[model samples]
Target: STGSATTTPIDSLDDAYITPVQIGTPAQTLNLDFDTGSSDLWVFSSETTASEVDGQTIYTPSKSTTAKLLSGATWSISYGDGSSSSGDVYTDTVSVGGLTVTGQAVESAKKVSSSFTEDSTIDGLLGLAFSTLNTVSPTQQKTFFDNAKASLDSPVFTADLGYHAPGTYNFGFIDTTAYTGSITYTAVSTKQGFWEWTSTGYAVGSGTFKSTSIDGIADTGTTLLYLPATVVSAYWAQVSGAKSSSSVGGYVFPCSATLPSFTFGVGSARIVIPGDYIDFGPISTGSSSCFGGIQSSAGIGINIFGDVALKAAFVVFNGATTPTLGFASK
Candidate 1:
């Protein structure tokens, strides 16, 4: 079996990719963020506090005949950004694209962070990371992908994120037309419960590729690319008037400055991120200074190859007994 779904950016900054997911018997469709950085498929629901609920769709399990409460089960999750959500659990029939999974654990949010409430475009999050990271207590739950993997032709999924356009997520098979050239495969470490891998190296603009090992996670949930301070500083050095600012919270530069493209290695394959992509957007509305998409990961503790980098290639999260990552230019 196979499935596919279209993912679109929630905002102009490509803050997060939203995909439509159907829940319950009658099929209540809601826009959910396909987050690979965390585990636990959670959603805004009738159980959530009214004060915490914004202009977002809610999943009312009471209305679904197939919904069954997971008595004594509960879950709580906090993201790297500090945003958090907690709730109880339920089992229901959930579908993504045309792929269906029965008795899928559906976490209904009872409390949510203010940031989540502010982002009305996102109704919830569907975690694609390893189920080991699941936050449920008493009885941990499998992620949607994990539950559906056995039924799929192949236990794998692909993320084809876009810039300001819509991309796709495919399960069970690799779409040959979605990418170009041969896929470069790399070993993944699931010990961290993330799709973590070591990158070959990096280069600034047209510079020679630096031979160094950079470890990071391919996180579709995050919005920007985060690398070592050295690599980030080097990239920004090529752009005139660029500087790391504490006041603005990250590297920022004159919006009119000429930005340089960034290149990173995946084994022998080189993926180049267009300069325009690095120019994340203005620091403020109509501001002359722009925030950078590539920033130092010093504070983050670990590097993250987020949407900014993923948008340049087709990424495969292989879930075989021995997990591996595959990257191909699109």
Candidate 2:
């Protein structure tokens, strides 16, 4: 048996993906972002101050017979985007699709930053990162996937993300129909509590492949791909009208700019990201200014393979002795 869920682009914003999650007895449903960048299953709850609720959904723990306070437990999380939340804890039954886990640690938020409050549609985050990253204090918590993995027919999950389209996240199994060609596997180094892997090299369009090795993380929570400044500058030089915008704080090109295909090497195999995906919509609503989906990793220590890059392939997060990432064209 396997667990699965349907993920849809948030408000067609093309910025994030959300999937429904049911919690506690009688099951109150909440829309959660399945983030691979962080680990902590936290949600807006009744404990939240009324003013902080805004239009977001809140989980009422008192209403659930199975809910129990963890006494002194607490959790806090902050994203690179500057969004943050912190809260007390509870243990309840949390279910995703056909799989369910009893006594799962659930962090109920009491405070959230403006960035989180502004996103009224997303009630919480469902972290899929390693359990070691779970933020519960005193004792780390386990993610929904971690709790359900042992019972799963296979301890594997596949991400089939799309461009402004619906996708499925399958647990315990991989559906070959969802991908084309053969899947390429690469060893992952989880020293930083992330799916960190090194790309053998990369190339711009059909240009000569650059042999610079890049260490990066596979982050579904992030919206763009980030690499070294040198590579970013080289890619932008090939496109006329593309330049670094001080106002936007990233490389932007005209809306009509034709982007070249970007490919990265994984051992002997290569993963290609289409140019269309690199053009991450308009910089703002109805603006002729457009932001390049790929940017300089600059301040960020390791590169990041965010949705812009992940959506182009069928990704398998393999949880073996040494975790491995398998990518295949879709």
Candidate 3:
């Protein structure tokens, strides 16, 4: 087992807070945001009292005596970094960590923005990135893993992105108990599912990077590692006097130094990202030390590897059986 389970505290998919399930005999608790980009598994309730609910957290169908809401369609979502969230569109009976997505199709936000409702504590989001980013909307909300993948038993779905407890985002058994064997997949290629990515090598400080070609594609809806700006300014100039701040949006280091010992190469697996895990939780904005992680790629073309390289590798996708998107070792 790679490291048991963890992942909680989402701030985007629109309040991804869900834990416990059993709907029809009643046992409800729903609030979700575990999106990989978009795969649908939505929730948000109490008739969604708009105005972003001030400090949001809604899903109390009378506190779940068997909560239900679905009538007169009304759901909206806009992201391509334009970021958006709307309300109304239900078919309740959702479950995660309990896994029982019965007729599930949720999306209930009144209006969120502050990245997703100011200082988001996650109330929705669980899009497993790519069913073509999930919803380019060819119809009325159609892409929650193409409707939860026929109750997915295996066409594959098991993501355990747990670090500092972020709800580990698991799906339909692959718990491997965190692994021991038999869980290595890679096959979903966007072919060129644009938005971008391009990393050939990076492992500076422990040295060895910019060696691209693992048929790359690992986006928890992207955040950083969009490298290739000379391998992110030569891995932030080896982290010491790491500079190149276009006033932030691009690269700005020196979080009091010692945050470098990186390692990332996937065509032949070799991952290590421990510079206090990219300076763990550093969100300061006024003294110019802003970091939660940003190595800022050079001449970007949409290079991505977000979530600290997905907490150090194990991204298998078999594209339903090889067109290649695999990258083992977890």
Candidate 4:
């Protein structure tokens, strides 16, 4: 297929979007980050005695609050990078942005590390990947979406990066301001959201390019774009001054000055990776010192949607439509 001058579709859209909500409760209080890379609701509590917390939003049971914890089962979670947290489960009257839900799920994190401790601006993380992707212990209980969908106005949810940190999450609904007139959505697997993607096409500037690269997943938990070293090298070799060097497992270059536009084929969409993004500056010292645009991944399963791809377009995930996801602009 070729690039045709089609008017980007803007149809009358339904306010129906599914999401892995973030509820800042009024009864039993706490804050958390709504993470789409994973599924679960875990938060820290005021009872944690170990770490030195600065500017953290602690949950207090007193003050005659009405929120309650479900199951009464305590849990612990650890990321592959040694980042971990532990806590008990509870239900609370949640207040997210302007939406409120009674008996919302809450995780009272009792202990956390520096990554979770120092970055305590947000109370905890509201995971949104998939139930199977849920990192919760025991692994038999219902996930946040599976639970929230039971009695939702719509059996749907979607999310957009609203605020950076310190307390913001959407559980049952999505904010309209997150995008413009109409938002496009991409279907996701109900099993997990581990950055599974396909290069449907590629383009430079406005001209689409054919691709031979492998399709990969888009992940947030990871911080950088990873591609096959040989394929990446072969592509970058197109530019004369384009050089590949290591900066924390990546290759950076001065694409802004010497290279033209480099594009990626994502499914049917063509995404262009700007030359300016290749200008990875001041990362370290050496001939391979600059930040790398195409970095190598020791393994292929964990590719991430680093800042480069995120800035290219506004990504919307609609769980309401069932087995389907939509992708559109901001």
Candidate 5:
């Protein structure tokens, strides 16, 4: 069994990616952020506080004949950005694209943070990270991908994220036409319940590749590429009028600055991120200073290869007995 879904960026800055998912017996469609950084399939629902609800589509468990309350079960999760949501649990039929999973655990939000309420485009989050990261108390539940992997043609899925356009999430098989060049495979360490891997090195624009071991997670939920301060400084140094600003936060440069491409190593393979992708956008509308898509991960503890880097290549998330990650130029 296999499936494919189109995921579109929510805004011009590629702030987040959302894909439609169907839940319940009548199949209420909701746009959810397919997040690979966490494991908890949560949704805005009838249980969410009225004040916390904006324009987001909410799942009404009461309306679904197949929905059943998971008695004594509850879930709560907080993200790296400080946003959080918590609620009770329910089990229902869930479908993504054409693939369906019966009795999938769905967390119905009773309370959501301000950030979630403000982002009306995102109805909820569908976590794709390891099932070990699930937050459901009394019983940790499998992710949608984990639940479907056994029946899949191959225990794998791929993420082909786009910059300002719609991309795809493919399950059970890799789409050869989605990328060019031979795929580079890297071993993944799930010790921390993430798709963590070590990047061999990096280069600033056309500069020489610096040989260093940089460990990070390939997180689709995050918006920026965060690296060590040294690497971030090196890349920003090449751009004129770039500086680390405390008031504006992180690194910012003149909107007119000529940005340079960034290249990172995956074993022997090299993936290049175009210059324009590094120019995140103006800090605010009509502002002359722009926030950088790449920033220092020093404060973040572990480095993060987020959407900024993922959009530059085709990524394979293998769920085999020995999980691995594959990167290919697109």
Candidate 6:
């Protein structure tokens, strides 16, 4: 089935993109973060303790005729950023955009970390990663897209993330109007349960491109671009007042410093990120100090092409057979 959804930006945070997802028969609508980093569609629900439930909208399965509890099933998930959620599972109808999946495994949260419970806007999380990465216990669950893909027009989805603006997520079909020029396709390695691909090389501003390849994931949930420590150091060195700061974390420089544009190789195409995007605004409380959007992927092991880089290009997450990532100018 061909369908689409509108993805909006989170105010002030400039973090993850949020989309509307309807669950159950009568449809309990919730604003969910469409995260490709994880695979669990967990939501705040009646099963959650009253004290733990903050301003999030709850999904009461008892009220939906389509909701059926998966006996003895449980699910727990933790993020790289330390946020987590755990809960019971239920087989229900979950719909996104106009596509609906029957008997989809929905994780209803009974426990959540303060990071999630305190965020009122995000009622739940709709994971877009491979279903194999699902965290349901006793029996792993199928993602909504997985259950619905067989009947879809094409087993593909596109993420069009806009910087501080509304974007579109199209399924089963790609919108030609959303991108410019021909889409460049690259082989993707999803063995790690992410849209992982290798960058042929990267460069700062108009500098020479390196031939060294860097493996990384396209993570819309992440706010900044992360690369090897050496690459990060090289980029920072080009800035006038750039330095590594433990107090601010990562590399930071004077906000007024003239930053250079960053470019990466996707297959034979060069996707360039503007210099202003690399300046991720000013530091939390320190004036004139700003965090570099490009940071070192020290502990994360693999590099991450977060929103800062992803937004610079339109990405297609192809799930048909050998998954491939298609990139093009927005």
The residue-by-residue lDDT of candidate 2 on 65-104, one tens digit each, is 9999998999998888878899999999998877789999
**lDDT, candidate 1, at 191:** 91
What are the per-residue Cα lDDT tens digits for candidate 1 across 5-81?
Answer: 99999988888999999999899899999999998999999999999998999999999999999999999999999
Ranking by lDDT: 5, 1, 2, 6, 3, 4
lDDT (0-100) at residue 138 of candidate 3?
A: 32
| Per-residue C-alpha lDDT of model 5 across residues 54-108, encoded as one tens digit per residue | 9999999999999999999999999999999999999999998798988899999
Better of 2 and 4 by TM-score: 2
> What does the lDDT read for residue 166 in candidate 5?
96
- For model 3, give the 10-residue run with minimal summed lDDT: 12-21
Screening candidate 1 with a backbone cut-off below 3 angstroms (N, C-alpha, C), the clashing residue pairs are none
lDDT of 3 by residue, 1-330 (tens): 011124553543211233333333355443444445455444445665565554545565555544455666665667655777666655555545455555555655555655665633455665655554433233355444445555666544544454444545444344445544343333354555421233446667766455655233466655454555665666677766556656555565655777676776644555666666555333454554645365544454455676666655555432243333434345
lDDT of 2 at 92: 99
Measured by lDDT, the strongest candidate is 5
- Model 4 lDDT tens row, 27-133: 44444444456566776566665554666766654432665655646667776446788777666655444345456556667777777676645566666566666
Q: Of the candidates numbered 3 and 4, which has the greater lDDT value? A: 3
Query: 267, model 3: CA deviation in Å?
Result: 15
- How does each model score on TM-score? 0.99, 0.96, 0.33, 0.69, 0.99, 0.96
Give candidate 6 misplaced runs (Cα > 4 Å).
none
**Candidate 5: regions farther than 4 A off:** none
Whole-model Cα lDDT of every candidate shown, in order:
0.94, 0.88, 0.51, 0.50, 0.96, 0.88
